[PDB]
Each structure stands twice: as C-alpha cells, then as structure tokens.
Design a protein around this ligand. Structure first.
Ligand SMILES: *C(=O)CCCCCCCCCCCCC
Ligand SMILES: *C(=O)CCCCCCCCCCCCC
Lengths: 160, 160
C-alpha cells in the first residue's frame, strides 16, 4: 500500500548523516551515495519490470517517458518533466520542481560540494544497466543550492 | 503524493549494510539503528501533529490507536493490529503481518542477533517523548527470524 514520503526522507537523512560521520569529506559522501544508489538500482529494476508493461525494450526516448511518468511516480510520488533533448536525442533532462528527499533539510556551512540526493543518480544508472543501457546521470541543478528547480541530466552512452 | 515502498526499503537496506561495514558487530548495528530512529522520531512527530487531529493529548490507549491506525498507514502503508493489552493498560503489542522494510531481504549466516528493522523502535520512542510520553519499544517477534508475524511490544513508563 502507498505511503507518504516523510519517514523515507528522514531515513535517507540518517544515511547521509552517517556517511558524513564515516568520511568527513563531502566528495567521499557523494561517491558513496552514488555507489549505494547503483546497487539499489540493480535490484529495483526487477521490481519495476514485474510491475510494468514495457517488456524488453531499449529505446532511449521511451525510457525517458517511463522513468519520468511511471518510475518516479511509483517510487517517489512525483512526476518530473522531460526537457532539453539534445539534437541527437541521446541526452535529456529530468526537471523536479519538488524533491521529497530534500524535505526538512537545510544544507549548512561549507557543505556546498555535497550532492545531497546523489543516491538517485546511482539508482538511475544501475537500473538502466540491467536493461542493457549504459548511461550517465548527474545533478546539474538543486533546489537545496538555491536553484529554481532540481535537474538531473541524463546521457545515453551506448548499448550493453 | 503517495509512493510505493520499494525504493524506501532498498534505501533502508543500504543503511543497514553501511552500518554493518562500520561496526562489524550486530549489537552495535542494532544500537545505531535505534539511535537513528530516535532522532527521526523527534522530527517526524512535528509532521504528524500538523497533519493529524489529535491535538495535545497523553492517553496511552488513544496513542496506541493513533499509532496503529493513522501513523503506520501514513508513513509505512500498513495498519498493524493492536493486541495483548496488559491488565494495567500500560502495555500493548503492534502486530505486523507484513513489514515493508524486510522486503527483498534474507537474514544470513550468524546474523541472528541483528534486529533488522530496529530503526522503528527508536522512531516510536522519539516521537512519543515529544508528546510527553516516556515509553519502551522493542521487537519481540520478526518474520525475518522465522516468526509468524512481526511484533513490536510497547510499554508506557511514565509521563514527562
Ligand atoms: C523501454 O525502451 C523502456 C524501459 C524503461 C525502464 C525504466 C526502468 C526504471 C526503473 C528505475 C528508475 C527509478 C527512478 C526513481
Ligand atoms: C493522544 O493521546 C494521542 C497522540 C498520538 C501521537 C502519535 C504520534 C505518532 C507519530 C510517529 C509514529 C510513526 C510510526 C511509523
């Protein structure tokens, strides 16, 4: 059954806090969050494929639509918009007006290099690798850093 | 907006995995999970009170009903049953047939002392402390350990 995001967001917060304690270095935390996200994505994809009707596909644009309109809604309760497609159609952006994971959070002094929700990039990359799609996911905008929106840039590297 | 539990459960899994790496001792992990839960509960209560109609109360039985029928549903998508009330009415149990947090999980060799979802005990204790209620929350049954259900025993210690 569906649930609100508050407990999830606070739990993610505990994770970030623990990593900051474990490494005392924002860059290390960013790296670990992405790694964990990757491992999560490799597992999460099995659940998604079982609960969706995409079957076996490899189309990048279809993948963008499914990620934004189905996966994000299913696992985070939000529907980001798909924007800025590259001429080649191998790059696009996910625009989030609101990011549940940053609720109740206030990025402190000197923590500017920290990419708080970096876990999501790993999830996207790990999940897509399992469907034979090598991609690059990265944050280019973050409301926690004063930006108007949160933006995840997606780039298709090659088929695996 | 509401969301499924899979990403939350896998994220919690990453947290437990990290703690196991950080301490290499199940008892330490249990302790840290509970501590984190406590900190989460102290914050989560503010969100709950703002989104509920309980106002300022201190009744233990009412609290049990609200926890099981409102809070668990709101934050975890499940409604545990309330059972085994003590004669004094200062103790009760939360019975969970299904615990989202243990999905996709298989408690390994020698990890028997680990209380995988211990975070929840801390959440309950921390949240209740903020409403002037000192309590003890502990797992007495766990489906991960072969039990028929997951059981969280709640005991009212005193008003703060
Ligand atoms: C076929 O060409 C489309 C296949 C799309 C598969 C998308 C899998 C995404 C699941 C994980 C994303 C989680 C985002 C929060
Ligand atoms: C008045 O006597 C009842 C007040 C009950 C407050 C309950 C607060 C519970 C919120 C945190 C529990 C989270 C469980 C997943």
């Amino acid at each position: 059954k569906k649930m609100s995001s508050e407990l999830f967001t606070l739990t993610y917060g505990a994770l970030v806090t623990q990593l900051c304690k474990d490494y005392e270095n924002d860059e290390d935390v960013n790296k670990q969050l992405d790694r964990m996200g990757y491992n999560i994505g490799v597992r999460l994809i099995e659940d998604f494929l079982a609960r969706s009707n995409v079957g076996r596909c490899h189309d990048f644009r279809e993948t963008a639509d499914v990620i934004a309109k189905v996966a994000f809604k299913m696992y985070l309760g939000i529907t980001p918009s798909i924007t800025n497609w590259s001429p080649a159609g191998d790059e696009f952006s996910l625009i989030l007006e609101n990011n549940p994971l940053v609720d109740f959070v206030e990025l402190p002094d000197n923590h500017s290099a920290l990419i708080y929700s970096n876990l999501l990039c790993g999830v996207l990359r790990g999940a897509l690798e399992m469907v034979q799609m090598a991609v690059e996911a990265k944050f280019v905008q973050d409301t926690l850093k004063g930006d108007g929106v949160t933006e995840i840039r997606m780039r298709f590297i090659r088929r695996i």
